[PDB]
């Protein structure tokens with residue numbers, strides 16, 4: 001069901017390598033709904049090419065807009081399995097430090113703080 005369960009390690013690496021070749025200024029991000037989430041909708045896709053100059057605060061806003069959330073819906077985002085240290089961090093730096101060995105940057109969202 002999850003991205004890693006649907007694609008082999010080889011397939012994931014080769015896709016990241018393709019993204020470096022054809023979309024060099026983008027960060028390859030996998031964004032998935034927490035498996036127990038009951039309030040927030042699922043996204044229309046899983047793999048996102050994020051401009052590498054945005055910060056985490058902006059990425060949160062982007063994802064909230066893609067989910068068409070209103071102001072009273074809570075949204076929490078994990079990166080590489082843990083909470084964000086700061087929303088101010090540039091995504092190019094987050095990628096360097098938090099990328100998976102397959103080359104994707106993995107994120108999970110939920111409406112509660114306890115995924």
Ligand SMILES: [Cl-]
Pocket residue numbers: 022023024025026
């Ligand atoms: Cl590009």
